Paper text:
PPR proteins are RNA-binding proteins found predominantly in mitochondria and chloroplasts. PPRs stack on each other to form an extended solenoid structure that can recognise RNA in a sequence-specific manner based on the identities of amino acids at positions 5 and 35 of each repeat. To bypass these limitations, we previously used consensus design to engineer artificial PPR domains (cPPRs) that are highly soluble and, via an appropriate choice of amino acids at position 5 and 35, can be designed to bind RNA in a predictable, sequence-specific manner. In this study we have discovered that cPPRs bind not only RNA but also ssDNA in a modular and programmable manner, analogous to their RNA-binding capability.
We solved the structure of cPPR-Telo1 and cPPR-Telo1 bound to its ssDNA target using single-wavelength anomalous dispersion at 2.1 and 2.0 Å resolution, respectively (with sample electron densities in Supplementary Fig. 8). Mapping the electrostatic potential revealed a highly asymmetrical surface charge distribution with positively charged residues in the ssDNA-binding cavity and a negatively charged band along the exterior, exposed face of the superhelix. Our structures provide the first pair of structures where an identical PPR protein compacts upon binding a nucleic acid in the canonical, sequence-specific mode, providing an opportunity to understand how the conformation of the protein changes upon ligand binding. cPPR-Telo1 wraps around the ssDNA upon binding, inducing a massive compaction of the superhelical structure and decreasing the length of the protein from 104 to 64 Å. Overall, the rearrangement is based on the a helices on the concave side of the protein moving into closer proximity as bonds are formed to the DNA with a concomitant separation of the b helices on the convex side. To allow the separation, an extensive hydrogen bond network between an arginine at position 16 and a glutamic acid at position 19 from one PPR repeat and a glutamic acid at position 18 from the preceding repeat in the apo protein rearranges at three out of nine possible positions leading to a more open arrangement when bound to DNA.
Residue numbers in the entry: 18 to 367
Amino acid sequence: AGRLEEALELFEEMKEKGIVPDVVTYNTLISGLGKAGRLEEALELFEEMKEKGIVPDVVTYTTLISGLGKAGRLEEALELFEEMKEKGIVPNVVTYTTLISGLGKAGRLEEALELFEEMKEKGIVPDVVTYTTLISGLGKAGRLEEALELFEEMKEKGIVPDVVTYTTLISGLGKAGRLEEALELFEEMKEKGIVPDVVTYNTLISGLGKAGRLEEALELFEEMKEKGIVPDVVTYNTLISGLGKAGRLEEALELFEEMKEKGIVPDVVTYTTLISGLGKAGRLEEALELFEEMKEKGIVPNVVTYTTLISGLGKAGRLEEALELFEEMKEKGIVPDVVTYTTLISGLGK
């Protein structure tokens, strides 16, 4: 039960009656307090048991360190960990894992790695949490090659990686343009029965899109849909941006229609790529319809949107409409630039 207040009341009573509490009494209470996040009181009882000649054990220390770890009190958890080792108390996997997770989360990777080396030397065997924690930590720091080396090591030790491990690595590799390796980890992940998620697919599609390998990006987009994975605003913007750069305007407009059909909300980036694409193609009636639609949908145009339409309208001799959008642009607080002015001056001077 979570009846801690009564447990504490009974503890006060036994001490008044002259009954001496033992390691069991203290461990239960400290464990109860640690689980309730009442760590100042858990630490008072730990000090009290020590003064009373009661000797703490692995459970006492692990409960306190777990509790202080969950409270963001990392420096105090590391101090108790040094203390437990001085008293000859042997730390276990839980102790090492809670500390490495805390250190990892704080970006204290040199110390997280020293504790990981130490647990191996003391015969403590790391598990999926130990490795995942370190991989995530190293990943966030840009320390990708070190993360990859621990991934190789974890597999040699028969520790099975999960979605988190793979997704952290694929993300880091895709960001660095190391696509062939990202794709290799993706193939391995599926082969081992690990199920990719929206994060796995979006990273690879972003990566492939930014490298202009769009047929592959589209193949993976089709695959995620067949696998029951749901594309989001990022998946769609990446593909639209990618196909837009490739001059594949009609396919980018078809995905834009698809995304709205699936209730995915397009942003300023989606609308802009399309408006520029259409503008560049002289498809001004359609660029203007999308411009009207983004306003009805709450999407606020910026200087690129206005410039594209002005440059577009200008090139088509549609000068009075270009001038009207120029006025609107200034009414809406968007600041014109060299391009906006030079486009209008050309058309007017012509």
